[PDB]
């Protein structure tokens, strides 16, 4: 029922494409 | 409303609601009808028996006829003028009034109007119209048919459906010896009347179908001309 049913997982994935990538290099 | 809510009764049976299945099926079906069949007909078969429906739908083979929910038919054929499968189909989709009603063929442009100007079948009164019958159940001990034919050839009515003549139909009946007996002669209808819901359902109970029934025709559509003919015969 939250209105911002779009931005949330988008921000989580913006985080994840960095939390994953800042292991290797 | 937390509580004190109308509980929706569940009675068990084998079938079940479909959902969007048959509706999407109907959309695509009229799609793969429009792609082939050149001659399309519109029909308004308001009050029909399914026997009559089957025996009009089977009458010819090289055909295609649909009983599609009007809104689905319109959203398929084109809801507005511009957007549509083919041209001028809005011209037809603006012309729905009943259980419409869509015939697909590639044949004579006149044999169907001939067949309809021929077609008659007997049916119930289907109320709000003239009834060529003035049905007075005679005050003598009633019979199953309604009181127009010899009595020694006909069976007296059934006790169990006396309450449904007293309650839903309001004719003064007191059972006697197991039988339905009335006191004063009653007429359930005279001729000409805009028949009432009961002034029809009583005829439906007494099982007397004497009403002309015909399926009409209003318009047309061609996959060559790409527009609509309309000769108004009903």
């Amino acid at each position: 029922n939250f209105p911002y049913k779009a931005k949330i997982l988008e921000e989580i994935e913006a985080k994840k494409m960095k939390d994953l990538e800042e292991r290797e290099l | 409303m937390p509580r004190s809510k109308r509980s929706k009764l569940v009675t068990l049976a084998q079938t079940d609601k479909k959902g969007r299945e048959n509706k999407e099926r109907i959309f695509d079906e009229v799609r793969e009808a429009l792609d082939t069949y050149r001659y399309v007909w519109v029909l308004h078969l308001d009050d029909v028996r399914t026997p009559v429906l089957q025996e009009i739908r089977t009458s010819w083979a090289g055909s295609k006829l649909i009983m599609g929910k009007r809104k689905v038919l319109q959203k398929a054929l084109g809801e507005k003028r511009e957007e549509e499968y083919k041209e001028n189909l809005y011209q037809l989709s603006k012309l729905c009034s009943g259980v419409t009603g869509l015939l697909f063929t590639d044949e004579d442009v006149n044999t169907v109007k001939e067949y309809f100007k021929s077609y008659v079948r007997s049916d119930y009164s289907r109320p709000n119209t003239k009834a060529p019958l003035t049905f007075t159940i005679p005050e003598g001990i009633v019979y199953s048919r309604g009181g127009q034919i010899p009595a020694e050839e006909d069976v007296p009515m059934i006790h169990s459906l006396e309450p449904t003549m007293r309650n839903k139909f309001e004719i003064p009946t007191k059972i006697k010896a197991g039988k339905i007996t009335i006191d004063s002669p009653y007429l359930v209808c005279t001729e000409g009347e805009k028949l009432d819901v009961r002034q029809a359902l009583i005829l439906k109970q007494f099982g007397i179908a004497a009403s002309e029934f015909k399926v009409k025709v209003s318009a047309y559509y061609d996959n060559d001309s790409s527009t609509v003919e309309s000769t108004n015969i009903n």
Partner: protein, 171 residues
Amino acid sequence: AHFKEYQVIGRRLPTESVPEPKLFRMRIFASNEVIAKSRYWYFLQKLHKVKKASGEIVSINQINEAHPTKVKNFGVWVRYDSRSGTHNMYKEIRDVSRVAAVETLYQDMAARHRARFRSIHILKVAEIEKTADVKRQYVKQFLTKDLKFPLPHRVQKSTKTFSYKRPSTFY
């Protein structure tokens, strides 16, 4: 109390070979900086294994509403640890400032879930910009056009004990 919204920062104790640590930050609702910082430590502890003995607090500031006049429709997330297994919850508050909305939210929680300040965790308080993002009734009632409703049987409040009028409710 009369709430305020602090923003707290923390830089869990630096070391050589692991210096200049990551500088986390939170928005806290509290009455006094003391309680803000206590909540902040606790939220760290619950998120991941940090501690107070092995971490430090950098700068606790206080924020304010850039427009504490414009009436805004806040939508709040909440979640809490009581009294069975946890759960989430989404409520809405048509109010004027975020700290006010959270005041009323704590009130409603203590009224309905009976649940106290230990469990309730604010997750996200978002100011809705468009109508038709509001979906709740008791908030959409006031979002209608040309509102005009009368006061609820406005009963008098007396200062003296014996009156001489048989008061009339207003009207």
